[PDB]
Design a protein around this nucleic acid. Structure first.
Lengths: 167, 127, 197, 122, 106
RNA sequence: AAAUUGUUGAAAGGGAAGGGCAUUUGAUCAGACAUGGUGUUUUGUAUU
RNA sequence: AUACUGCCAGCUGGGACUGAGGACUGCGACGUAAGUCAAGGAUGCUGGCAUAAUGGUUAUAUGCCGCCCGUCUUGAAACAC
RNA sequence: CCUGAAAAUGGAUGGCGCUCAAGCGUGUUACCUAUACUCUACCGUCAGGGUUGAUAUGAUGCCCUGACGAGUAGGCAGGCGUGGAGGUCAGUGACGAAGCCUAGACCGUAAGGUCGGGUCGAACGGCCUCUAGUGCAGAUCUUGGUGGUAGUAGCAAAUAUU
RNA sequence: UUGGCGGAAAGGCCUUGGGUGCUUGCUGGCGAAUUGCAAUGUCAUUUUGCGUGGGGAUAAAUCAUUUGUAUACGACUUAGA
């Protein structure tokens, strides 16, 4: 054979991790990110669309909406590093925002077995989006051209330099 | 998939081939150090093939580990599987090339019963 | 930045323009150079003619058909200057010279398109006033280029057509300005002015 | 094997300039062709769809002689015989078909994009 | 609009190199519109993509992407240094890369 | 067996070829996922 | 006053590379004080894939680089053997 | 700066080219990049140390710490292979040993080891030691075999054949 | 569809008129979701092949023979229903 009998024996117990000292602390967003601020979504299926920033969510996300009746962006969350803050501000008072958070944005992800070789929204979500968009529109109409601006998708023209540009 | 170890880093995954083994058929690829007085490889000129050095040595925490993290152990029978019986996460069995077909299926069955991983559970089997 | 950049070679110093264009071609820019007969080189005509004669003296002794090929057209002179500054023996340099195009006068694909200049290569900006300079067409004729008269004739024809076009453009511009004078100075013009435009 | 052989007008048909007329080789090859045709007839083949599917001549053991050179020297005088083999086959149409399935692997974003394009474009 | 682009254009100039030795691990990128380091500072840390097309379809697309990031500024002329998860193929000297506006700090 | 050669197949081939670093493309291939474990929809009706 | 210089155990931002170690022990900080911490080495949240996608090998292409080994020799790619 | 200033293949501030320079002299910064320096990981070497639990681990074990690493001629060390020998694996094998082929996989910095597939048909290997006719790229090395040259030089003296 | 212009590499630029689509010049109604917090998230061609339906016209070159204004051989003047 290879060996008769090993006099020296190793151990298979899975070592416990040391007591790490990384205590999480709340995120500090940039000053330009305040609720009721127009944001250009830089990525996703809604890239370049101008939405309204509503609330800072628990998992470092940003609760935004189009409004849906304006540009078609539903009540979603987006990453704060994939939007551009814009100087345009829309008042947020009169709009309820405490309802939505990470538990509201649940998915119940489909199984690994269910393969989409060939291959709907919840009534509560559509209703609360209707209410939130109604309040947002009621406030938005007080500023001219805001609805048209929020419907228009942002884009980079030829000769547009982002490092000199202001939003 | 096994005991907590650093990723297996291969500092030099390329084979160290002898100088001019491509130039001449009589020069085999087995590495030999150039002892020539004017040798560019021995003098380590820019653009020439690298030579094996101790600095290429693998991390001692991952040396001899398979891609799966086990250590290969050549076996020839169930008695050879016995020494691995209780170290399933650290060693894997490799049935010797000259084991006959029936003894190979015997070893494979015992390793399957005992949870031991075999690196070649496909030899002498229909494909 | 642009698909193709077309440079009016008139009034440009050949070496500065060739350095600029070589850098652009290696950076990935397609470039067309026109009016290569109107390119400039600093120094007197006799000086640069002697320089070209020193160039001509060099040829492979045992077979002149192997030696340096001394091209005579101003466009080919500029191309040689630029090939000197591109590493033309590698595939990257071959691709850069494939991106470059240079002509005498302005052929039909480009007399209808905008032509740019390179201020860091323009003689009027770069040369100190009073310094002598040569014109590549004159030098090329002196060293054996056979089409200075044809190029000048076609250039006069193209210039006549382009001057007619410019007169038509000025007429259209004056008419639109005079007709939109009324629509101007309106409320929308006031808002655009107060908001910058 | 044509270095320093002469040119001919009959190489133009094949795009070359160097061609020759190896009478002995041609006789051997057509004798073997007749043998193969007889075998195909014995096996019951078309004999008109037959085409030379395989042909292969390689070197055989050399037959040795000697030649005599100035200042009392001996050199080799070698024949270069050939093993010739060939196979004639019945010509056939495009037999190979049924290409691969090419089962696709897509992500969630790709699946959603495909669903949206299906919904929008008919 | 007919313009949908959400990125800045850039050119992959070459590798990081001395006169006679290059380093394929670090590429040099010229962001089109930038001519000074003080203006290149905006693009520090932004993502870069080299998007090419291959005739063979892999995961439902014939388009392949290699991702990277702007690490620092290079020189006096607005060129920056970029690093990619895979080194750029070196056939792409003077090819077009997409400098996205994320991760954003505006 | 090798040198050397034929055929077939695949690639490259603007005055050599071969090599190193690095990626890309084509080809090819190894490496967790039923498995000691989470508890119930007991499939091919001591066991999952 | 400003400039120039020196200092700050001054403040506020944008980037990049790294995350070795693996129960505790130590030195410290925090309203001193039950406890928490950025204090003797990265954790937390999330997503897609789970397959040649990453990776390995191989052939090519591209950027840069790369003279033919052995030998005698102060000196060899040598028009030295 | 110019004259002085003439050598033989065509020709070299490296080349293109450059003229308020991309020249010369001198100041000021910014920037580029060595196998150098700083910090980090990993390898080895050396050094200094710690460690007697009845426990399940052979104390040249398990650890902590720091500094180092160019190399011909040369010295020493630790190892990898080959033939044969003593022990042992009550080792592998006609249900296929050895050998060979395989831009297949794994392991080792490497010498190399292990395995998948094809071919083959009778022996062979791991480990602890012993032993040597023990490792090749060269020696105008030896013997055998084979090439390019190359379907090439050539097969033309002595009258001549039909 | 109409009238021109453009030979430098024109192969493009103007122009009369009849249809049809849109128009963000101003004001509306409806849809967007779920690609789940980003993944270029596939929208431009350069060629080729295989077919479909609407037209259009039904050759030569080489070998072999000949020639000798030609010729080492190829190649070349030539002729040949």
């Amino acid at each position: 054979t290879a060996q008769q009998a090993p006099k020296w024996y190793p151990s298979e117990d899975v070592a416990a991790p040391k007591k790490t000292r990384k205590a999480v602390r709340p995120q500090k967003l940039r000053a330009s990110l305040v609720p009721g601020t127009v944001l250009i979504l830089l990525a996703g299926r809604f890239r370049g669309k101008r939405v309204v920033y509503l609330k800072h969510l628990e998992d470092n996300t940003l609760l935004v909406t189009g409004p849906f009746k304006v540009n078609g962006v539903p009540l979603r969350r987006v990453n704060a590093r994939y939007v551009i803050a814009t100087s345009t501000k829309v008042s947020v008072e009169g709009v309820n925002v405490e309802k939505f958070n990470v538990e509201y944005f649940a998915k119940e992800k489909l199984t690994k077995k269910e393969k989409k070789e060939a291959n709907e929204i919840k009534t509560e979500r559509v209703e609360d989006q209707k209410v939130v968009d109604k309040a947002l529109l009621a406030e938005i109409k007080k500023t001219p051209l805001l609805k048209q601006y929020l419907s228009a998708s942002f884009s980079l023209k030829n000769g547009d330099k982002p490092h000199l540009l202001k939003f | 998939a096994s005991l907590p170890h650093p990723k297996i880093v291969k500092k030099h995954t390329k084979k160290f081939k002898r100088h001019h083994s491509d130039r001449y058929h009589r020069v085999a690829e087995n590495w030999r150090k150039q002892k020539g007085i004017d040798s560019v490889v021995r003098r380590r000129f820019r653009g020439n093939i690298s030579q094996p050095k101790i600095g290429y040595g693998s991390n001692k925490k991952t040396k001899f580990l398979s891609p799966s993290g086990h250590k290969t152990f050549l076996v020839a029978n169930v008695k050879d599987l016995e020494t691995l019986t209780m170290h399933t996460k650290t060693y894997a069995a490799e049935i010797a090339h000259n084991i006959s077909a029936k003894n190979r299926v015997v070893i494979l069955a015992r390793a399957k019963a005992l949870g031991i991983k075999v690196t070649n559970p496909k030899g002498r089997l229909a494909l | 930045v642009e698909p193709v950049v077309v440079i009016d070679g008139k009034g440009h110093l050949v070496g500065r323009l060739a350095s600029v264009v070589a850098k652009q071609l290696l950076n990935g820019q397609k470039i067309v150079v026109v009016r290569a007969e109107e390119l400039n080189i600093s120094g007197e005509f006799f000086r640069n003619k002697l320089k070209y004669h020193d160039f001509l003296r060099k040829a492979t002794a045992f077979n002149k058909t192997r030696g340096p090929f001394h091209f005579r057209a101003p466009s080919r002179i500029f191309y040689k200057a630029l090939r000197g500054m591109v590493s033309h023996k590698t595939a990257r340099g071959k691709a850069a010279l494939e991106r470059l195009k240079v002509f005498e006068g302005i052929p039909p694909p480009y007399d209808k398109k905008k032509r740019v200049v390179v201020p860091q290569a323009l003689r009027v900006l770069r040369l100190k006033p009073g310094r002598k300079y040569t014109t590549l067409g004159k030098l090329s004729t002196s060293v054996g280029w056979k089409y200075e008269d044809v190029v000048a004739k076609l250039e006069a024809k193209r210039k006549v057509s382009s001057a007619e076009y410019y007169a038509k453009k000025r007429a259209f511009t004056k008419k639109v300005a005079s007709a939109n004078a009324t629509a101007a100075e309106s409320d929308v013009a006031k808002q655009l002015a107060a908001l910058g435009y | 094997f044509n270095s320093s052989i002469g040119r001919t007008a009959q190489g133009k048909e094949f795009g070359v300039t160097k061609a020759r007329w190896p009478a002995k080789s041609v006789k051997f090859v057509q004798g073997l062709l007749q043998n193969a045709a007889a075998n195909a007839e014995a096996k019951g083949l078309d004999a008109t769809k037959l085409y030379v599917s395989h042909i292969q001549v390689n070197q055989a053991p050399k037959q040795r002689r000697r030649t005599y050179r100035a200042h009392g020297r001996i050199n080799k005088y070698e024949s270069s015989p050939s093993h010739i083999e060939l196979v004639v086959t019945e010509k056939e149409e495009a037999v190979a078909k049924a290409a691969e399935k090419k089962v696709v692997r897509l992500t969630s974003r790709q699946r959603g994009r495909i669903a949206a394009q299906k919904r929008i474009a008919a | 609009a007919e313009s949908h682009r959400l990125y800045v254009k850039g050119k992959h100039l070459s590798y990081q190199r001395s006169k006679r030795v290059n380093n394929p691990n670090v590429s040099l990128i010229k962001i089109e519109g930038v001519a000074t380091p003080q203006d290149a500072q905006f693009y520090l840390g932004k993502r870069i993509a080299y998007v090419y097309r291959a005739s063979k379809e892999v995961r439902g697309s014939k388009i392949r992407v290699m991702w990277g990031k702007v690490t620092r500024t290079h020189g006096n002329s607005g060129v920056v240094r970029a690093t990619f998860r895979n080194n750029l193929p070196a056939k792409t000297f003077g090819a077009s890369v997409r400098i996205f506006l994320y991760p954003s700090n505006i």
